[PDB]
Amino acid sequence: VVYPEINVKTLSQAVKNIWRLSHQQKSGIEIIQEKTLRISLYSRDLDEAARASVPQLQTVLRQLPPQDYFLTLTEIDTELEDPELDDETRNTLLEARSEHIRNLKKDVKGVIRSLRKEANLMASRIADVSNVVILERLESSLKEEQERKAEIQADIAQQEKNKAKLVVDRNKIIESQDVIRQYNLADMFKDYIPNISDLDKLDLANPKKELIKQAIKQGVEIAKKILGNISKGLKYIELADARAKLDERINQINKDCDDLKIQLKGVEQRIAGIEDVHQIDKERTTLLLQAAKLEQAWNIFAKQLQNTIDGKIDQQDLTKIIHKQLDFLDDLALQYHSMLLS
Ligand code: NA
Ligand code: NA
């Protein structure tokens, strides 16, 4: 027979993590929010049962060794060897050991009921935490939100790119207005913006010619395309009118990007919430492994003492079984005593 190796820190830390996750998680499903609180509540109850079982079973097992029959049965059986008085000594000593054995069975029956009581209790705790169903179509939900996150991020990226193009198209028209305003082109050329050929004839330095000549050509070409002008010349008021439409469209894109960034926080919070629920299931799996080993240990402990008192009573064998079972509990207490959670 071998006892399970149990880490109660891994058990208790997992219960601690379920509590933390069940309260910060914000997937916004609500029934999941309630079910996660059920798991944390029953998880803490399981942890309480595990912590109480150790000093409970220690108390029960420690009552057996100090009994008189452990020592006196060895003294009876050792003196029940040599040629003795067959009635006065031998018959009487047999009836004395039968009295001791009846008390030994009665005590060992009692500690077995205590071990079974802890096993059945831990089994009820394991049932409570495990029976809460949380992963029904949660892999489906995680896929849905990440798909919605993908197209929102894709929309923001396109919107930002379409805005970036409109920003330069706007800035090209602004540069055209600046050279018109700086050199008073509206004063010379009435109503319509001067052509590229007309700008050459102006009294300007050669670097200044190419400066304004490129500005006008670029801003006019853009403005004409926006107003649907593929025929006539461009007026100054039409240049400002062309900019006004771009400012309206850029402002509209900024508003649309703000609404998308609100939705993006929504999906990211819900994906984070779904990931915490997935983590709660993994923390629950971790603690149940340790919890199942406690149930197993007590049922092993019970049947081990049962087999000692089924047939012939090996007084001194039982003393080893108790001390081995006690050393196992001493270890569990050592873990709880020096436990540092986080
Ligand atoms: Na409780
Ligand atoms: Na129940």
Residue numbers in the entry: 12 to 353
Sentences from the paper on this structure:
We have unraveled structures of the soluble components and the pore assembly of the YaxAB cytolysin from Y. enterocolitica. The crystal structures show an atypical fold, comprising a head domain reminiscent of ClyA family toxins and pronounced coiled-coil and foot domains unique to the YaxAB system. In line with our finding that the isolated YaxA and YaxB head domains form spoked oligomers in solution, the YaxB head domain in isolation was sufficient for recruitment to membrane-bound YaxA. Together, our biochemical data support a role for YaxA as the initial membrane-interacting subunit of the toxin, able to bring the lytic effector YaxB to the target cell surface. Therefore, we propose that this class of toxins defines a new structural family of α-PFTs.
The orthologue PaxB produced better diffracting crystals than YaxB and thus served as template for molecular replacement phasing (the two proteins share 40% amino acid sequence identity, whereas YaxA shares 18% and 22% sequence identity with PaxB and YaxB, respectively). YaxA and PaxB crystal structures were determined using single-wavelength anomalous dispersion (SAD) on selenomethionine-derivatized proteins. Because our PaxB model could be well resolved, missing merely the N-terminal 11 residues, we will utilize these coordinates for most structural analyses throughout the manuscript. All three proteins adopt similarly elongated, α-helical folds composed of a five-helix bundle head domain and a two-helix-coiled-coil stalk, tapering to a narrow turn in the case of YaxA, while connecting to an additional α-helical domain in the case of PaxB. For the PaxB head domain, Z-scores ranged from 7.4 (soluble-monomeric ClyA, 3.8 Å RMSD) to 13.3 (pore-protomeric ClyA, 2.4 Å RMSD; PDB code 2WCD12). Our monomeric PaxB structure, while complete, might hamper a true comparison with the protomeric YaxB unit, since it is derived from a different species. However, it is noteworthy that the foot domain represents the region of highest sequence conservation between Yersinia and Photorhabdus orthologues (60% sequence identity; Supplementary Figure 12b, highlighted in black box), indeed pointing to a common principle of pore formation.
